[PDB]
Design an enzyme around this catalytic site. Structure first.
Site, short mmCIF file in Angstrom:
data_model
loop_
_atom_site.label_atom_id
_atom_site.label_comp_id
_atom_site.label_asym_id
_atom_site.label_seq_id
_atom_site.Cartn_x
_atom_site.Cartn_y
_atom_site.Cartn_z
N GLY A 184 0.92 -1.31 -0.03
CA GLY A 184 0.01 0.04 0.02
C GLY A 184 0.73 1.15 0.02
O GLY A 184 2.07 1.27 -0.15
N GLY A 216 5.17 7.30 2.55
CA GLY A 216 5.89 6.60 1.36
C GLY A 216 5.15 5.33 0.75
O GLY A 216 3.83 5.39 0.96
N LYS A 234 8.81 0.27 4.67
CA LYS A 234 8.13 1.56 4.17
C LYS A 234 9.39 2.61 3.51
O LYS A 234 10.19 2.91 3.98
CB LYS A 234 7.82 2.29 5.31
CG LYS A 234 7.11 3.62 4.73
CD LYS A 234 6.57 4.32 5.86
CE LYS A 234 5.19 4.09 6.48
NZ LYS A 234 4.85 5.19 7.62
N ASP A 293 -1.67 10.56 14.79
CA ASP A 293 -2.67 9.82 13.89
C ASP A 293 -2.94 8.50 14.40
O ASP A 293 -3.16 7.51 13.54
CB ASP A 293 -1.66 9.69 12.77
CG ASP A 293 -2.61 9.59 11.54
OD1 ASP A 293 -3.89 10.31 11.59
OD2 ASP A 293 -2.22 8.98 10.54
C1 904 Z 1 7.27 0.38 13.69
C2 904 Z 1 6.35 1.73 13.57
N1 904 Z 1 7.07 2.83 12.46
C3 904 Z 1 8.49 3.00 12.66
S1 904 Z 1 6.06 4.01 11.72
O1 904 Z 1 6.90 4.42 10.69
O2 904 Z 1 5.41 4.61 12.40
N2 904 Z 1 4.77 3.01 10.59
C4 904 Z 1 5.28 1.68 9.70
C5 904 Z 1 6.61 1.84 9.36
C6 904 Z 1 6.75 0.93 8.33
C7 904 Z 1 5.79 0.04 7.91
F1 904 Z 1 6.26 -0.86 6.83
C8 904 Z 1 4.51 0.16 8.33
C9 904 Z 1 3.63 -0.78 7.96
O3 904 Z 1 2.62 -0.33 7.10
C10 904 Z 1 3.59 -2.34 8.13
C11 904 Z 1 4.52 -2.89 9.03
N3 904 Z 1 4.49 -4.11 9.34
C12 904 Z 1 3.15 -4.31 8.38
N4 904 Z 1 2.49 -5.73 8.45
C13 904 Z 1 1.67 -5.62 7.32
C14 904 Z 1 0.81 -4.53 6.69
C15 904 Z 1 -0.20 -4.64 5.92
C16 904 Z 1 -0.34 -6.01 5.12
N5 904 Z 1 -1.53 -6.11 4.28
C17 904 Z 1 -2.28 -5.07 4.56
C18 904 Z 1 -3.45 -5.38 3.40
C19 904 Z 1 -4.45 -6.71 3.45
C20 904 Z 1 -3.49 -6.36 2.47
N6 904 Z 1 -2.18 -3.96 5.06
C21 904 Z 1 -1.05 -3.91 5.77
C22 904 Z 1 1.62 -3.43 7.14
C23 904 Z 1 2.71 -3.27 7.93
C24 904 Z 1 4.40 1.19 9.40
F2 904 Z 1 3.26 1.01 9.80
#
Ligand code: 904
Lengths: 249, 239
Positions: free
Chosen positions: B16, B18, B32, B122
């Site tokens: 999904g 950045g 990310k 957020d």
């Molecule tokens: C640790 C917090 N940070 C440093 S931060 O910068 O505050 N936040 C931050 C950083 C990096 C990241 F990759 C993500 C991130 O999004 C996910 C990390 N692990 C995941 N595992 C699964 C998923 C996911 C999979 N599939 C679906 C859909 C059903 C298809 N939706 C979601 C998303 C992610 C993040 F939220």
């Protein structure tokens, strides 16, 4: 700083010293109950904290902080469930092969992670592998890590500890998973196993592995259990292989 | 250092935006990718944000695992199985026991962040991932979704109390199974009405523990100071 100011932790029941506690949710606390820590007690603490501080991985027990002022204390996440030892050896419920493979994969990822950080566990065994919520592997009990007899490589029997030793111990853990038993069911004498494994006259009975066990896993198991330490694989290859066959079936 | 050397991460499917990817690094990871070539001006602005994630070690907070600077700036975290709290609530039946537990864990995560003096800014159902459909993981704290925005934020706008309001809306989502102001499909109206205090979530749409609703109403206070702190929030949910 990961120093948790004391008095912030509500300590609860004993587990084995280790207490279940309360700190922004459920936590586990390892408290050294001494009046005043030995110089040796201090360095053991600093070392374990120093190595825990460098771990951020889902298959490693989550370090959360330490306490110093009243007592030496190491705070980690609270794991619900039992050790892999309990599930395999002290419980009626046995696992399907797919999960056993998965348990092996998760352990290898954790071990691979540690070795990538130049960390040797030096006490990998089924008892130090916590099945958090009975699915997610957590490698823990970090008392001896740097930077139990049945899980010892011959060169540890006879510095003996290395990445190779961790590999051997992982080999035994595999043997546990694929057999459901501990190595050397025949032997009941400590000093017999010690001499026999040390000499190289003894090794786990791979004939005891389940009929379901993939030949790829059995082969790998044998490799991690090689008597000559340098003949044993590294965790990158170990993880790759386990990852290969997991998809394979 | 927590920097992961160039090449060690194998990047996979776009998840999904950045932009987030699934990847391989000593097992599964989430990467990310920042919308960034980087200047020395942006580099030490990036590490500043990592330094905040660097001090989060909690089971209900998404596990930060490391960062990249080559080929591009990236945050590396654990990979979560399953979908967000948003997807479960608004796209697919939790027993009341689990809903409270989901609420329970989010409070633990938030309380921890505030104790670490970290304002999320957020919090919302899609920044709350359900790992293995059991464990809550709060991420994304390192034009917009206004449903979770406290009235002071709309018009120290960002504070611990505004986080509490966001949590309140989350409590509302869990207990109603739907988004607030569903009756009114107009961002500008919601922005104006919530901002002026004329509109608040409809609690007529919540088998909900009456202490939870009081707490939910306590979190949803238009008045910033009338809102409880997370330690008190956690204590009441726990009990
Ligand atoms: C640790 C917090 N940070 C440093 S931060 O910068 O505050 N936040 C931050 C950083 C990096 C990241 F990759 C993500 C991130 O999004 C996910 C990390 N692990 C995941 N595992 C699964 C998923 C996911 C999979 N599939 C679906 C859909 C059903 C298809 N939706 C979601 C998303 C992610 C993040 F939220």
């Amino acid at each position: 700083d990961w120093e948790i100011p004391d008095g912030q932790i509500t300590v609860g029941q004993r587990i084995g010293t280790v207490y279940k506690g309360k700190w922004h949710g459920d936590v586990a606390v390892k408290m050294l109950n001494v009046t005043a820590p030995t110089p040796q007690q201090l360095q053991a603490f600093k070392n374990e904290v120093g190595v825990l501080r460098k771990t951020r991985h889902v298959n490693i027990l989550l370090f959360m902080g330490y306490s110093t002022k009243p007592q030496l204390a190491i705070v980690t996440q609270w794991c619900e469930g039992s050790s892999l030892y309990h599930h395999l050896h002290a419980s009626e419920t046995k696992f399907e092969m797919k999960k056993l493979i998965d348990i092996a994969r998760q352990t290898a990822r954790g071990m691979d992670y540690l070795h990538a950080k130049s960390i040797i566990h030096r006490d990998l065994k089924s008892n130090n592998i916590f099945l958090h919520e009975d699915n997610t592997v957590k490698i823990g009990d970090f008392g001896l890590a740097t930077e139990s007899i049945l899980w010892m490589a011959p060169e540890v029997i006879r510095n003996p500890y290395s990445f190779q030793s961790d590999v051997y111990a992982f080999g035994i853990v595999l043997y546990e998973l694929m057999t459901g038993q501990l190595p050397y069911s025949n032997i009941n004498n400590r000093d017999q196993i010690i001499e026999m494994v040390g000499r190289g006259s003894l090794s786990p009975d791979l004939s005891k592995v389940r009929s379901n066990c993939p030949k790829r896993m059995k082969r790998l198991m044998a490799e991690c259990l090689k008597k000559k330490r340098d003949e044993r694989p590294s965790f990158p290859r170990i993880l790759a292989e386990i990852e290969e066959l997991a998809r394979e079936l």
